[PDB]
Paper text:
Here, we describe the crystal structure of the catalytic domain of Pro21717 at 1.4 Å resolution. During refolding of the precursor protein, an active protease (Pro21717-CD, residues 145–483) was produced by intramolecular cleavage of the precursor. In the asymmetric unit, one Pro21717-CD molecule was found, which had a classical subtilisin-like fold consisting of 10 α-helices and 8 β-strands. Pro21717 contains three disulfide bonds (Cys207–Cys254, Cys296–Cys333, and Cys439–Cys442) and four calcium-binding sites that may influence protein stability. The fourth calcium-binding site is unique to Pro21717 and does not appear in other subtilisin-like proteases that have been structurally characterized to date. The CaIV ion in Pro21717-CD is stabilized by Asp385, Glu451, the carbonyl O atom of Val362, and two water molecules. The predicted active site containing the catalytic triad residues (Asp185, His244, and Ser425) is located at the C-terminal end of the β-sheet and forms a deep elongated pocket. The conformation of this density could clearly be identified as a small peptide bound to the predicted substrate-binding site (S2–S3–S4). Thus, the final model structure of Pro21717-CD contains only three alanine peptides in the substrate-binding site. One of the distinctive features of Pro21717-CD compared with the AprB2 protease is a loop deletion (α4–α5 loop) and a loop insertion (β6–β7 loop; residues 391–401) near the active site cleft that produces a cap structure covering the deep hydrophobic substrate-binding pocket in Pro21717-CD.
Previously, we identified Pseudoalteromonas arctica PAMC 21717 from the Polar and Alpine Microbial Collection (PAMC) as a microbe of interest because it secretes a high level of a psychrophilic alkaline serine protease. Preliminarily, the domain structure of the translated pro21717 gene was predicted based on the results of the sequence alignments and secondary structure predictions. This analysis showed that the Pro21717 protease precursor consists of four functional domains: a signal peptide (residues 1–27), an N-terminal prosequence (residues 28–142), a catalytic domain (residues 145–483), and two β-sandwich domains (residues 489–593 and 611–708). CD-Search was used to identify the catalytic domain to either the Peptidase S8 family or the serine endo- and exo-peptidase clans of subtilases containing three conserved amino acid residues (Asp185, His244, and Ser425) that constitute a catalytic triad like that found in trypsin-like proteases.
Author numbering: 145 to 483
The structure:
Amino acid sequence: STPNDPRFDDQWHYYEQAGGLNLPTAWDTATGSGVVVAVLDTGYRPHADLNANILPGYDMISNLSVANDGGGRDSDARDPGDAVAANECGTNGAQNSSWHGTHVAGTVAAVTNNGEGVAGVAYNAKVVPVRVLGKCGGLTSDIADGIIWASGGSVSGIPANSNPADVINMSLGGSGSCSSTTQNAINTARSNGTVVVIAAGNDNDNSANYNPGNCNGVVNVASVGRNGGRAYYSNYGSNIDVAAPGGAQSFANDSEGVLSTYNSGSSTPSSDSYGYSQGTSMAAPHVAGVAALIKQAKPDATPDEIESILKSTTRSFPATCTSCGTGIVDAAAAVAAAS
Ligand SMILES: [Ca+2]
Ligand SMILES: [Ca+2]
Ligand SMILES: [Ca+2]
Ligand SMILES: [Ca+2]
């Protein structure tokens, strides 16, 4: 099926033969109904083309300066904006707000067939926003608590999650080895039945050396462009499980990117928008959305079974993708394999 959203045709990454996810055929069978995806990111804005698919979440950011919302941990996972001034994070230049989590969440589950905006990969799933990134990024320990809570595990001082996730998406990372705090959290999420999907990073380097994609028991995702070959920035290596479209842009908001829900604010939030972004951060929620399609078709699927289905049903690369996992995720084939 093809949705009626007016920007669907701009979302090449869902349907073109070279670099797309092969979604229309998948949507004949699965859309994510009944499945919950936790998006561990900067938070969200209640975009008109997203909010109906948002569930209550949690804000794990403990450092008040990073949190930028007046306090420590709290129940409102909305994104206040992560804009920074020059040298606020050390030696950085000034940066506008990313609205990264709004973009990622829309790839997972933008409201679809509403005649407005964009479509989402798992458009009948629901997203639990777990805010773990703010100004200058996020703390490993807050991210790890996010993983635990998102899965339905217990974190001291935090109310129980009433919407435990089937799938975690982490479009985030840094350099270096996977820490024990992170691996512990991942092990907890997997033991609770939650599959963990992670962006491999954007350093054009060996993915062995970038976390949390280098943790064990995760689905680590490389990025292809619209050509179906490796996006120039994508990490690559033996620990990549699969690839998905993350886009390959040559200027800001280039339509060669991945189009999703977004916000027009430079610092503070403003009007809803749609924007094209790129990264392994954009590839990961494609894969998280397919994991949700799989879980609708196979409700008792384990994390290892979901990873196996994703990896075993990929399609060929039409252009060079060295050490990009088994292939490009093929939503239709994955749903068939889970049915
Ligand atoms: Ca707070
Ligand atoms: Ca908050
Ligand atoms: Ca829409
Ligand atoms: Ca893996």
